[PDB]
Ligand binder design. Structure first.
Ligand SMILES: Nc1ncnc2c1ncn2[C@@H]1O[C@H](CSCC[C@H](N)C(=O)O)[C@@H](O)[C@H]1O
Lengths: 254, 235, 144, 122
């Protein structure tokens, strides 16, 4: 009916922490949009920042302009940043003056988990946002008789109803006769998952994990197991306080 | 190789007879159709559709705004355009050519919508912030297949499977006739003809700024609706 | 039976036109075949598969750029009929070899050897094709 | 202006092309239903009437030469010169000039031959 089985096909592939070693590097500085990052890695490929903009708020947009990215930090590489609808704009123009070029975008469309459970019937706890998503996942073909557009989010927004989140992804080419290795078409620009209405901007695990898996697939060469190399060719900012993903040079702001 | 039969003599002429009566059949049907149209028959385009068919560069928007002031007194409220973008494997649609057109003259109080592909997403932002418009929101349309799958769009860096549209604001958008948080900014509908667009976005706009003149740009015969002053080379 | 296996819905006259065009131009020069225009309504892919059937070997990598006799290759493929010739086509044992190996294979193989009434069109253009179709038929009867 | 219909008519008169909307007319659905490139304004039909006045039905092959209609097409023009005569075949008017119609009255009496859709079968 809805063909929703194919919509969440990759969500059925779950695949959900390396200690400080040759495979994982850890940095915990109280400053990040000011701390030099070229000393934490050079000629890297994947560079992720988990910028939780929100209009409470986690990070101020105007702060981002003071961060410096040097060519010595990375010649050929990519930055990944989050976008929030109430703070949409004023974020799409900051990064170009730091020396990147726009290539593509990625986005997450939230299908209103409360509406999904309502259609299955015919504030949420951590359990209600972790196991309830499995609950609506395993019976994914019972609500396929309904309309897709019904179960979308209805969140307060000045102009429309806010429904989706967004990953801006920016590649810089900086060295002539040098390129990057990419898998390219791995995960569709359209993806599908539900998200709690309490923090639609926030993305919990099994979805953050989905992004982690897709980025690990897009840039496999950036990773390095402890035996092959000790220095990691891909770093991260603003991760969880307990997750230290292998390959990533984690930089958590305390 | 000749498509027709090489030699059949009168054996084919009999078939000719068949064909020729078929011929008369078509024209007699045509006559009926003629009687059906020259009697007062109403076509699909509804009332209050104003299809200005002219080149956007050739057209003088000054006459348009003069008519706007003369008849209504309020200038435009909601505007849209999905111009032919650049693909790099007409050529006067250079994004700069799209820019220099004085849409800022055509609008002082109201929104805007601009659909564009992600390959020209960024240039769209500079397209909208250049004027008094401020990019505030986006409406996105997810392609659908016949069954309910996701279209396997060509992938440059990721598998392209959605289409984006930007929204802007100049002057005052709280003109009373505007409505806020009308509904979701996403549209899930099938993949129609080449670069076609969902007709439910016009329902969205009717929810948005009803009882007022509109302006879509670069239309086709599909686009025309009620209360839509519309422009388009193929319109 | 079923010699030179036929694609669904193509005349054998088209097959012999293709044979003549391949004998004059050569395998792989499908663009020249389109330029000549002796096979209307044919695509490069479909003519490629038809060449696969006519040569008797499914893989055309060993026959690229060859003005070889199609029937001779088909006959020598029956000379090696010990291999399963599915659809009268031999599957090449070489798995997509390098350009050098494919090139030496090329060298060795060289050395060895109604219509408009359809389309759901409106009355205007169908009659446009119909009247001069009838003129063509009238001229055909006149010369008969 | 909340007078949406009058407003629309005014804008159509002020901006829209003549072949799109009449001088003070409605949307003119006839142009909409036909495709862009071939439409029959009163100018085109009066020009074809002039062409009929030129020689009438017969060996009159200058139908496209005069370009009386906008980008005249021989088959479409010969098709659209037939409803005026009201008879499917024109063999009974071959080789003569025709001034007015005087053909609908002499043929609508033929009930068996045909009177529906303002036309007669053969
Ligand atoms: N400069 C131009 N060159 C060619 N066609 C143009 C054109 N400007 C407008 N058009 C016409 O309008 C289309 C561009 S717009 C296409 C989408 C349409 N506006 C919609 O919303 O449904 C073209 O395909 C053509 O039909």
């Amino acid at each position: 009916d809805n063909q929703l089985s194919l919509l969440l096909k990759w969500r059925n592939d779950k695949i959900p922490a390396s200690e400080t070693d040759n495979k994982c590097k850890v940095v915990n500085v109280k400053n990040i949009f000011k701390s030099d990052l070229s000393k934490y890695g050079a000629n890297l490929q994947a560079l992720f920042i988990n910028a939780l903009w929100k209009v409470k708020e986690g990070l101020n947009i105007n702060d981002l302009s003071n961060l410096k990215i040097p060519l010595s930090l990375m010649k050929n590489g990519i930055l990944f940043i989050w976008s929030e609808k109430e703070i949409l704009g004023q974020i799409v123009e900051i990064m170009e003056q730091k020396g990147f070029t726009y290539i593509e975008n990625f986005s997450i469309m939230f299908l209103g988990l409360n509406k999904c459970l309502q259609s299955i019937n015919h504030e949420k706890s951590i359990e209600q946002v972790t196991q309830e998503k499995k609950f609506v996942m395993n019976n994914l073909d019972i609500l396929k008789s309904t309309d897709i557009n019904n179960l979308f989010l209805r969140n307060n927004y000045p102009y429309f109803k806010k429904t989706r989140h967004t990953l801006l992804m920016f590649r810089r080419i900086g060295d002539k006769n040098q390129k990057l290795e990419l898998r390219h078409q791995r995960t569709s620009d359209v993806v599908f998952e539900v998200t709690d209405e309490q923090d639609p901007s926030k993305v919990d695990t099994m979805m953050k994990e989905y992004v982690y898996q897709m980025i690990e697939t897009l840039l496999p060469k950036a990773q390095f197991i402890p035996g092959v190399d000790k220095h990691l060719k891909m770093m991260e900012l603003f991760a969880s306080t307990d997750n230290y993903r292998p390959g990533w040079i984690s930089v958590i702001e305390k | 190789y000749l498509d027709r039969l090489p030699k059949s003599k009168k054996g084919l002429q009999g078939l000719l007879q068949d064909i020729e009566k078929r011929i008369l059949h078509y024209k007699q049907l045509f006559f009926k159709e003629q009687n059906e149209i020259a009697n007062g028959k109403r076509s699909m385009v509804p009332d209050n559709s104003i299809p200005i068919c002219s080149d956007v560069t050739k057209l003088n928007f000054q006459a348009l705004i003069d008519a706007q002031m003369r008849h209504a007194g309020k200038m435009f409220d909601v505007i849209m355009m999905d111009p032919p973008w650049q693909l790099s494997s007409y050529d006067s649609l250079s994004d700069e050519k799209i820019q220099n057109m004085p849409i800022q003259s055509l609008q002082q109080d109201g929104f805007i919508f601009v659909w564009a592909i992600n390959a020209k997403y960024r240039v769209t932002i500079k397209m909208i912030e250049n004027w008094g418009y401020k990019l505030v929101d986006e409406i996105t349309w997810v392609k659908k297949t016949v069954n309910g799958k996701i279209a396997k769009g060509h992938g440059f860096y990721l598998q392209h499977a959605k289409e984006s549209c930007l929204i802007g604001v100049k002057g005052d958008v709280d003109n009373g006739r505007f409505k806020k948080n009308i509904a979701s900014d996403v549209i899930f509908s099938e993949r129609r003809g080449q670069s076609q667009k969902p007709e439910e976005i016009y329902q969205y706009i009717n929810q948005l700024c009803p009882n007022g003149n509109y302006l879509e740009i670069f239309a086709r015969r599909n686009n025309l609706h009620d209360n839509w002053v519309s422009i388009g080379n193929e319109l | 039976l079923w010699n030179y296996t036929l694609s669904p819905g193509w005349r054998e006259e088209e097959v012999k036109i293709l044979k003549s065009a391949l004998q004059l131009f050569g395998i792989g020069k499908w663009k020249k075949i389109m330029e000549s225009g002796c096979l209307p309504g044919k695509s490069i892919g479909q003519i490629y598969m038809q060449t696969q059937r006519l040569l008797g070997q499914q893989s055309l990598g060993d026959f690229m750029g060859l003005q070889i006799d199609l029937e001779a290759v088909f006959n020598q493929n029956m000379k090696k009929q010990d291999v399963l010739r599915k659809n009268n086509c031999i599957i090449n044992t070489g798995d997509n070899p390098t350009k050098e190996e494919r090139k030496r294979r090329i060298e060795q193989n060289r050395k060895i050897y109604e219509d408009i009434e359809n389309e759901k069109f409106t009355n205007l253009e169908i009659l446009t094709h119909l009247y001069n179709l009838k003129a063509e038929i009238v001229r055909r009867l006149a010369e008969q | 202006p909340l007078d949406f219909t009058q407003y629309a008519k005014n804008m159509r008169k002020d901006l829209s092309n003549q072949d799109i909307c009449l001088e003070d007319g409605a949307l003119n659905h006839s142009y909409f239903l036909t495709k862009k490139g071939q439409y029959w304004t009163p100018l085109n039909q009066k020009a074809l009437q002039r062409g009929i006045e030129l020689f009438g039905v017969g060996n009159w092959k200058e139908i496209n030469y005069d370009e009386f209609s906008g980008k005249a097409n021989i088959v479409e023009l010969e098709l659209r010169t037939c409803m005026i005569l009201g008879i499917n075949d024109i063999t009974e008017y071959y080789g003569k000039k025709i001034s007015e119609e005087e053909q609908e009255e002499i043929k609508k009496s033929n009930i068996a031959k045909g009177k529906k859709e303002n036309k007669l079968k053969d």
